[PDB]
Each structure stands twice: as structure tokens, then as C-alpha cells.
Amino acid sequence: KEDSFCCVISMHDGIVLYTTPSITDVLGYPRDMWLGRSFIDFVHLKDRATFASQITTGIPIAKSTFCVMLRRYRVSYEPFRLGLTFREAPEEGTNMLLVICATPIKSSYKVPDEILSQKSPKFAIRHTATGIISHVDSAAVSALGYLPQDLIGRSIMDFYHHEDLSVMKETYETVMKKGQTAGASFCSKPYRFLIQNGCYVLLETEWTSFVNPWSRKLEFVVGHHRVFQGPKQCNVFEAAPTCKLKISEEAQSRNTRIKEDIVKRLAETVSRPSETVKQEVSRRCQALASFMETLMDEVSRADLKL
Amino acid sequence: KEDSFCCVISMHDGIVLYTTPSITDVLGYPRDMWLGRSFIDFVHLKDRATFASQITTGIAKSTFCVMLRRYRVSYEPFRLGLTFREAPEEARPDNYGTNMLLVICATPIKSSYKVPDEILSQKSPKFAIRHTATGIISHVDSAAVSALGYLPQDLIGRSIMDFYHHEDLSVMKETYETVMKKGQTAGASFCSKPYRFLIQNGCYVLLETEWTSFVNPWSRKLEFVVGHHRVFQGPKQCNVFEAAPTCKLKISEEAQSRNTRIKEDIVKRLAETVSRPSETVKQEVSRRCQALASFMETLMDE
């Protein structure tokens, strides 16, 4: 197992009816203090919209599992991986019941400036051509300290250390060149990334991308991350503990320009040249034709028939 | 089986590499006329953003509807089947990265009606449609394509209000007033009497609905309405896809206006916060510790 508590909400007024005893151990709340209270009253403001959008797109008219920050009793908020489950009323129109299973999320690091190996939490963050994070893997939470909803929406550029904007511009220029060939990937030298507590970590990234074959423009960039070196601060969830400052003029201005260029270049069209003419070695190759004839059936059957 | 063709696209340049011979009997295209060409060129304009988003978020497997042009121009609805398979690594002749292959099977969609003013049967189309508190259509079942003539994308994003016959806007209001009344009881439904619904071709059909909704229990606001429809009476024109020029009219002032003002009263009624009282209190919530704990026990061994 792992320290976790469940609670039972009423889909009529959103009040909490039952809380497992473990509630006092995991969050400090007295056995039956949650009783009768509104459940979202314990869900941090920044996460309610994520919560609302989850019980809206999940209601019955695994099962949904997302993250949120709950508050501790008698202030601080802590990260929880919640498991929603809708089931009909028991005991003695339909009365619905929501059962939530909150299990705490804890920081990936054991020592300051940890250098990781194979026990290393690998994870992917994906962003659009204009640099807006659209997806983040589960793993990313314990490693960076952000909840998926804390990153999605924001610009990936807000996380590259200011001194490193020029080195990132070259990594991104490399990503666009690699775009000439689909699936062409590449690992880059470890760079600093801003994590929840203001500290920076070194991330080793494998960069891949998707270019729309019809339009030839960049759809999204996805970095497969692994933390090369952890933060000075082990806890990745506490409030900003030191570490911040920069030279106004030549920085924010030079930096804002560099980002301007990266996004400029990412919008640029990629080359996918018409080499396919000599390629009538495969246009005439009996092997390829047979495979594709079959490929056409392995699919024509599967999807439309079942 | 059911009439259908399949093409194999290159994810590199987006051109089509292989085609089934049935392409000719389905779309009318000369067997290998499609080879070498860019696939979107055959996908209707209004369905390009749908086709783009689909391969993008997808790179059973993805399956959606799109309009494709025949060989002449007219277009026809098609249920596609996308499958991404890795292009068998070249024997060793050309490119030194991985090549991805897009396989697409297109089976033609046909109208759900054989004869005009089709009466209700077990064979009659049943499909649910969902719209937000403000009336924007957010979800439409696959069953509704052959029944109304609209492909999901032609419906998602529009106002549900744009489809009620102009003479029914007053009767639709009380129905909506009933949705909101029932919204006082979670999961309470009610069947409404048959009403007109505009279909792609301009004709109307009779839709008998069983209306249900979801009200956020924390905000006390209506979240969305879902209507389970059953086509009571079919369109005057069987083929719901080809726009038929036999249905029209206009009437401004006390119609265009008075009606457009009614839609608001309705959509303003949907904005009202619903009441969720409680003839239950304090210790009653703790009287159920044993009851709810046991419930949550069995919900655990699962």
C-alpha cells in the first residue's frame, strides 16, 4: 500500500459524507471534521478548474486520475494524485455518489544535487510551434514539482535559465534541421530548467518533433526528459527557497529577443523534398507492394469490422 | 462487408503510395490516379481542420467522418479508419530517422431513410446530443450523422438553438424550463413531445427526446444538457446529405427578432443557479459512518 485516504461526496450538494480514518494520518484532519463540508473547500484555488473539468467530463451520463493540491489541517497545501469513481447510492431520479481516493505525491530526490542513474524518472513534456506546453507525463510531477495543470498553458521558454537562452536557440535550430527527416531525434547536452521551488536542475533531453506532411509546418516539439542532476533543494514542492535575480536591461531585453527568434524559426516551414521518383525501386519492388496490400487488409478488417 | 477503399499515405510528404482497386467503384477515381498525389486535396475544406487534428493527436484506433470528392463537383460523406504503421525499414537502397506510414480505409456513409416522412420503428435512428449551459453543441453520437445529415464537426460549436423550427421556440422554452425544474433532482429525466429539428438538407424531422442534465453540485450552475433523441418522423427528402431546394421562407421583425429574443430567455434561464436544499443535517452525516464505510469497503476489493 501507500498512505492514502478515500472520501465519499454527494453529487447532489457536493458535501463530503465519509472519510476513511487514514485522513488524520495523511492530512492531519480529525476523523470526522470534513463531514458536511463542501469538498472543493479543500482544493486549492489554482486547481479547482482542473477538478471541475474532471468530474464534468467523467460523470456517467482506469477511471479519471489527476492531481490537485489539498490543504492540511491547522498554511500549507500538499500534492495529491486523486482517483475518482462514480457509483450509485447505497443503504436506504438517481442519487449519485462520488468516491475520491487521494494518495500523496512526494519529491523524487533523497539528497541535494543528486546525480541520477537507472532509477531515474523519465518523462515527456510536449509543446506547440509557438512554445506552449500542451502535455506533461505523470513522472514530471515528482521531478519538477509542477502539477500538469501548472505547466500546460505556459511557455516552455519561462523555464530556461536566462544565461542559457542562446544555447537553447541552437538546440532548437538543430530540432528544426532534424525535422527534414521524420522521427529524426537527438540528445543534447544537459541544461538548466526552472522547477517549482525556484531552483534549477540539469535535464538531459532527447528531442523529437512532428511536422504536418501536408502543410509542412511544425505542429509540436516533444522533449523526452531525464534529470541529469537534481536541485539544491530536495523538496520540490515547498515555497520558493532563495535563488533569484537578473540584470534588467541587457537581460530581459536580450532574452525576450532570443525567444522571439526561436518561435520565429519554429514557425518556419520545413523541407520534405520530392526525392521519390528514383524511388520507383520500391514503386516496382514486389516486396513493398505485397506488404502494403496486406497492410491494407490488416486494417480494413480490424477498425471498421470490429 | 460494405463498399470501401483503402489508401496508404506517406507521413513524410503526405502523398499517397498505395490504393485498393475498389477506389474506382467507390469514389470513381481511375485505379492509380490517386498515386503520387497529396491526400488532403480530396478532403473537403470544412473537414481539413478535423482531419489535421485527428492525425496530429493520434500520431479501436482513431475513427471519424470527413467529406471526399468524387471523380467528375460533388462530395460524399465517409467514415475513415486511421492506422499508423511503421514503413518497413528500406532494404538498404535509399534513406539513412524512421519513416511512418498512414493507412486509411474509407467506407461511405448513407442516409438513414428509405422513404419520405418515415414513421417510427425499432430501425429508426437513436442518438444522443449534448450542449452546454449556453447552448453550444459539444458532443454528437455517430448515429446522428445518417439521421440529420451533419458530420460532427458541422455540429460541434454551433448553437443548439439554431436548429429548432422558428415556430417552436415558445414550446422549446417550456421544455427547457422543465429541464431546469428537473435539474433540482440529480439524474431526473422526462420525455418531451416530438419537435422539429433542422437537418443538413433544409428539411425538418420529428425528434422525440428524453432530456437529462448535469448541474455542478458545487457552483449550483447547469453544466450541460444531454438529449436522447429518436427520429419520430423522417425528412420529406430521403437523402439528408444533398441540400434540397424545396424548403425555405424568412419573415423578419416579429419573427427574426421576436424569435432571436426568445433564444435569450431560454439561454438566460439555463444560466440561473439551481437550488439543491437539504432536509438532512448535522449528525445525520455521522449516523452513516458504518453504512458508508461498509459501502467503501466493497468498493475496495474491486
UniProtKB/Swiss-Prot annotation, chain A:
PTM per Swiss-Prot/TrEMBL: Phosphorylated with a circadian rhythmicity, probably by the double-time protein (dbt). Phosphorylation could be implicated in the stability of per monomer and in the formation of heterodimer per-tim.
Tissues where the protein occurs: Expressed in neural tissues and in several nonneural tissues of the abdomen. Malpighian tubules contain a circadian pacemaker that functions independently of the brain. Expression oscillates in all tissues studied except for the ovary. PER-A isoforms are mainly expressed in adult's head.
Loss of function: phenotype: Rhythmic changes in CCHa1 expression in the brain controlled by the circadian clock are lost.
Domain of life the protein comes from: Eukaryota
Compartments reported by the entry: Nucleus; Cytoplasm, Perinuclear region; Cytoplasm, Cytosol
Induction: Expression is sensitive to temperature but not to light.
Sequence ranges assigned to domain PAS in this UniProt record: 3-105, 123-229
Complexes and interactors: Forms a heterodimer with timeless (TIM); the complex then translocates into the nucleus. A proportion of the protein exists as homodimer.
Function: Essential for biological clock functions. Determines the period length of circadian and ultradian rhythms; an increase in PER dosage leads to shortened circadian rhythms and a decrease leads to lengthened circadian rhythms. Essential for the circadian rhythmicity of locomotor activity, eclosion behavior, and for the rhythmic component of the male courtship song that originates in the thoracic nervous system. The biological cycle depends on the rhythmic formation and nuclear localization of the TIM-PER complex. Light induces the degradation of TIM, which promotes elimination of PER.
Domain notes: Mutations in the PAS domain result in longer circadian rhythms and courtship song (PERL mutation) or makes the flies arrhythmic (PER01 mutation).
Protein's name in the database: Period circadian protein
